[PDB]
């Protein structure tokens, strides 16, 4: 009836409890305007990119390839001091991977569990209930990494250092 996370709000109709990650948190009624299968696919894809991106931010600041144009450890500034032919090559490759994984489908066409793209080559999901636990893990770490990557990139715009560098030396004695 009421929303589990937002006690004064009613529970959105399109949630129903069954779908993984539900604490009744849909105040702005986005599920009434869009299909939730597409929304979850977007949320999973966003969180997966964000987990990769946050891991990229930390590891790039610690280590980089033994080449010039990779030395810079600030993620934002690293994007620019690097061959752009390589960057577009990644962009094209991402376009390929997106097509094959989604089996050449559009918004209606994509719907198959949402986000189950089949790219799990190793048999981690042995127990299906352990799979469900990993699904909750996947969305929670993905949601955390979306905010976490956003904080890292905006720290990098502010501090100009990168994630671990911005944390270790944060200027307590000024704004």
């Amino acid at each position: 009836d009421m929303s589990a996370s937002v006690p004064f709000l009613p529970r959105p109709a399109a949630l129903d409890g069954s779908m993984v990650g539900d604490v009744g948190f849909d105040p702005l009624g986005f599920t009434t305007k869009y299909d939730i299968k597409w929304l979850r696919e977007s949320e999973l894809k966003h969180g997966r990119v964000c987990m990769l991106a946050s891991l990229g931010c930390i590891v790039q600041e610690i280590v980089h390839l033994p080449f010039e144009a990779t030395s810079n450890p600030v993620a934002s500034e690293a994007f620019f001091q690097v061959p752009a032919g390589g960057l577009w090559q990644i962009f094209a490759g991402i376009g390929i991977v997106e097509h094959f994984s989604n089996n050449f489908k559009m918004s209606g066409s994509t719907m198959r569990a949402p986000g189950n793209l089949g790219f799990d080559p190793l048999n981690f999901g042995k127990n299906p209930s352990a799979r469900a636990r990993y699904e909750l893990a996947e969305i929670k770490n993905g949601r955390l990494a979306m905010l976490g990557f956003g904080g890292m990139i905006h720290g990098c715009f502010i501090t100009g250092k990168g994630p671990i560098g911005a944390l270790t030396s944060m200027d307590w004695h000024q704004s």
């Binding site: 934002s76 994007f79 620019f80 001091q81 752009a84 032919g85 577009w88 090559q89 100009g160």
Partner: protein, 179 residues
């Protein structure tokens, strides 16, 4: 290999169509390109400088026609409107090349959107900032000559701009990127 005088676009092909795997060879073809986004911004800035500098004799040739006339007036409006448009565009582009040449990748948008609080090194600490100073003084000379009525003053000052901008390009040797 150089920048078109009027368009300021990479003109020569550079004779580099190498597909070359392994070593990229800076293959001017996209996805074989070895140029950074910063290098491409630098070539755009250099192209702006070429357009401005090639336009400098247009003012010189126009001012010579003015002086030759039956009665000479030194159109202060033309001289100023050239300076407000073409000459200021030169200085700002020269400053931006210096900014990228000194701070590095941060000026390419690494630090984010242009802000009132730029968190990078300024256009100073550059070996080619001295050339920017020459153009800035020349702009002041161009305006001062126009207010005074000195035809020779405008012509010499524009020549000073032309030498300074050419000097800037030669020391910088801006990377010619066609992608």
């Amino acid at each position: 290999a150089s920048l078109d005088p009027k368009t300021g676009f990479p003109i020569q092909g550079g004779s580099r169509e190498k597909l070359c795997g392994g070593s990229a060879s800076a293959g001017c073809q996209p996805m074989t390109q070895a140029a950074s986004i910063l290098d491409k911004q630098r070539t755009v800035l250099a192209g702006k400088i070429t357009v401005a500098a090639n336009k400098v004799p247009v003012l010189t040739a126009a001012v010579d026609k003015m002086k030759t006339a039956k009665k000479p007036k030194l159109d202060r409006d033309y001289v100023l409107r050239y300076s407000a448009l073409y000459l200021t565009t030169l200085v700002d582009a020269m400053e931006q090349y210096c900014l990228r040449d000194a701070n590095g990748a941060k000026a390419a948008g690494g630090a984010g959107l242009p802000k009132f609080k730029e968190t990078l090194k300024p256009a100073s600490s550059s070996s080619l900032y001295s050339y920017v100073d020459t153009v800035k003084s020349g702009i002041a000379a161009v305006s001062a000559a126009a207010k005074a009525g000195d035809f020779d003053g405008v012509n010499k000052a524009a020549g000073d701009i032309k030498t300074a901008a050419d000097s800037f390009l030669s020391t910088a040797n801006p990377p010619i990127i066609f992608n």
